[PDB]
């Protein structure tokens, strides 16, 4: 019995750690993407108002 | 050998020949249909998304600026409003400058297409876009972005659209 | 021509597992042509999804 | 007029469909190796092309290599059968 329980604990633990590593990587990927979108939108919006004003 | 189109206006046969050599296997041997043209349908980004909303195949974007340079993109997905970047690595930017150049994916990032209520843009990597267009399809901008490693697609970084077309393979 | 894809765990490093099979099937007994086959680091989802995807 | 373009479309789209099929084989080998072996993903996929009249000898060699991992076989396995026109 107990060796199968140790395997079940090891599998569940490894899935929890693997899922945490994937979720951390996704949150970091979205952090860089939404930085690119927001920075680009913000600079390009104000740059156009300055261009029409001058 | 040259492809079949249901009409045309920004492209001459020497532009058709050089584009049709580069389009992916997905769209080789399909007739080209004009989904949107500023000269047929009036000029706005809301009309461009409205005409594109029914589509489910790749598109070719063609732009002529006020300096008469021809450029645009081939895109794997129709131009739609999206919260996040979308598309795949068969997307490319192109220009006739006056010689034909095509800027395929660098492999660096997947920032291919992004559409907003007030703009449409392609590429990313910091504040850069390979191609950005305003809500009016009046002002646009092009600069080198690391998605494509492109040149300036127009004669200038900042440009005015003279006219614009979206073609679909269908 | 019929191929077989197979897969087996790395005994410490994946190259040792391939060296054992290439020896057993291609070098010594001439039973098959064989090679490595390249699969990228695809994203494992979660156990509840993988048992559906099969 | 229809023949030449129809042939070109068939040659292009056979290549597209075959390329797509071998990607599904890579997915099935991945998914079933993640299910059958340990979750720290460290398997080697291998492609074999058997000689004719040699099948039993090769099955027995593969079984002798991998019996300690325990149709069914003690390793992940798929055939690819490239004889499309029967």
UniProtKB/Swiss-Prot annotation, chain A:
Function summary: Subunit of the V1 complex of vacuolar(H+)-ATPase (V-ATPase), a multisubunit enzyme composed of a peripheral complex (V1) that hydrolyzes ATP and a membrane integral complex (V0) that translocates protons. V-ATPase is responsible for acidifying and maintaining the pH of intracellular compartments and in some cell types, is targeted to the plasma membrane, where it is responsible for acidifying the extracellular environment.
Taxonomic lineage: Eukaryota, Metazoa, Chordata, Craniata, Vertebrata
Phosphotyrosine: modified positions: 53
Domain of life of the native organism: Eukaryota
Example of a GO MF term: proton-transporting ATPase activity, rotational mechanism
Protein name: V-type proton ATPase subunit E 1
Expression (tissue specificity): Expressed in brain (at protein level).
Broad class of the protein's primary localization: membrane
One BP annotation, GO: proton transmembrane transport
Subunit structure: V-ATPase is a heteromultimeric enzyme made up of two complexes: the ATP-hydrolytic V1 complex and the proton translocation V0 complex. The V1 complex consists of three catalytic AB heterodimers that form a heterohexamer, three peripheral stalks each consisting of EG heterodimers, one central rotor including subunits D and F, and the regulatory subunits C and H. The proton translocation complex V0 consists of the proton transport subunit a, a ring of proteolipid subunits c9c'', rotary subunit d, subunits e and f, and the accessory subunits ATP6AP1/Ac45 and ATP6AP2/PRR.
Full-sequence portion shown in this chain: 4 to 57 of 226
Subcellular location: Apical cell membrane; Cytoplasmic vesicle, Secretory vesicle, Synaptic vesicle membrane; Cytoplasmic vesicle, Clathrin-coated vesicle membrane
Keywords from the UniProt entry: Acetylation, Cell membrane, Cytoplasmic vesicle, Hydrogen ion transport, Ion transport, Membrane, Phosphoprotein, Synapse, Transport
Similarity-based family: Belongs to the V-ATPase E subunit family.
GO cellular component: apical plasma membrane; clathrin-coated vesicle membrane; cytoplasm; cytosol; endosome; extrinsic component of synaptic vesicle membrane; microvillus; vacuolar proton-transporting V-type ATPase, V1 domain
Organism whose genome encodes this protein: Rattus norvegicus (Rat)
Swiss-Prot record, chain D:
GO cellular component: apical part of cell; ATPase complex; clathrin-coated vesicle membrane; extrinsic component of synaptic vesicle membrane; plasma membrane; proton-transporting V-type ATPase complex; proton-transporting V-type ATPase, V1 domain; vacuolar proton-transporting V-type ATPase, V1 domain
Top-level taxon of origin: Eukaryota
Keyword annotations: Acetylation, Cytoplasmic vesicle, Hydrogen ion transport, Ion transport, Membrane, Synapse, Transport
Chain ranges passing through the membrane: none
Single GO MF annotation: proton-transporting ATPase activity, rotational mechanism
Tissue: Expressed in brain (at protein level).
Localization of this protein: Cytoplasmic vesicle, Secretory vesicle, Synaptic vesicle membrane; Cytoplasmic vesicle, Clathrin-coated vesicle membrane
Acetylation as UniProt keyword: yes
Gene Ontology biological-process entries: synaptic vesicle lumen acidification
Family note: Belongs to the V-ATPase C subunit family.
Subunit: V-ATPase is a heteromultimeric enzyme made up of two complexes: the ATP-hydrolytic V1 complex and the proton translocation V0 complex. The V1 complex consists of three catalytic AB heterodimers that form a heterohexamer, three peripheral stalks each consisting of EG heterodimers, one central rotor including subunits D and F, and the regulatory subunits C and H. The proton translocation complex V0 consists of the proton transport subunit a, a ring of proteolipid subunits c9c'', rotary subunit d, subunits e and f, and the accessory subunits ATP6AP1/Ac45 and ATP6AP2/PRR.
Cited function: Subunit of the V1 complex of vacuolar(H+)-ATPase (V-ATPase), a multisubunit enzyme composed of a peripheral complex (V1) that hydrolyzes ATP and a membrane integral complex (V0) that translocates protons. V-ATPase is responsible for acidifying and maintaining the pH of intracellular compartments and in some cell types, is targeted to the plasma membrane, where it is responsible for acidifying the extracellular environment. Subunit C is necessary for the assembly of the catalytic sector of the enzyme and is likely to have a specific function in its catalytic activity.
Name recorded for this polypeptide: V-type proton ATPase subunit C 1
Organism the protein comes from: Rattus norvegicus
Location of this fragment in the whole protein: 274 to 380 of 382
């Amino acid at each position: 019995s107990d060796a199968d329980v140790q395997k079940q604990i090891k599998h569940m633990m490894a899935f929890i750690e693997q899922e945490a590593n994937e979720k951390a990587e996704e949150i970091d990927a979205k952090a860089e993407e939404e930085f690119n979108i927001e920075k680009g939108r913000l600079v390009q919006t104000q740059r156009l108002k300055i261009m029409e004003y001058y | 050998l040259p492809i079949l189109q249901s009409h045309s206006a920004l492209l001459e046969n020497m532009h058709i020949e050089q584009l049709a050599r580069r389009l992916p296997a997905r769209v080789q041997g399909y007739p080209w249909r004009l989904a949107y043209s500023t000269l047929e349908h009036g000029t706005s980004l809301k009309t461009l998304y409205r005409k594109s909303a029914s589509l489910d195949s790749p598109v070719l974007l063609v732009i002529k600026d006020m300096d008469n340079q021809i450029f645009g993109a081939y895109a794997t997905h129709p131009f739609r409003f999206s919260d996040h970047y979308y598309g795949t690595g068969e997307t490319f930017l192109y220009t006739f400058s006056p010689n034909f150049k095509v800027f395929k994916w660098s492999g660096e990032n997947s920032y291919f297409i992004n559409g907003d209520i007030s703009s449409l843009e392609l590429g990313g990597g910091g504040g850069r876009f390979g191609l950005w267009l305003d809500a009016d399809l009046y002002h646009g901008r092009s600069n080198s972005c690391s998605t494509f490693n492109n040149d300036i697609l127009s004669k200038k970084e900042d440009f005015i659209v003279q006219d614009l077309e979206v073609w679909t393979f269908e | 021509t019929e191929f077989w894809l197979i897969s087996a765990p790395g005994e410490k490093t994946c190259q040792q597992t391939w060296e054992k099979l290439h020896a057993a099937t291609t070098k010594n007994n001439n039973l098959a042509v064989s090679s490595k086959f390249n699969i990228p680091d695809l994203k494992v989802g979660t156990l509840d999804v993988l048992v559906g995807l099969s | 007029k229809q023949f030449g373009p129809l042939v070109r479309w068939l040659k292009v789209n056979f290549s597209e469909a075959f390329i797509a099929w071998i990607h599904i084989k890579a997915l099935r080998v991945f998914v079933e190796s993640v299910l059958r072996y340990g979750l720290p993903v460290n398997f080697q996929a291998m492609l074999l092309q058997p000689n004719k009249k040699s099948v039993k000898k090769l099955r027995e060699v593969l079984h002798e290599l991998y019996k300690h991992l325990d149709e069914y076989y003690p390793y992940v396995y798929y055939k690819i059968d490239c004889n499309l026109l029967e």
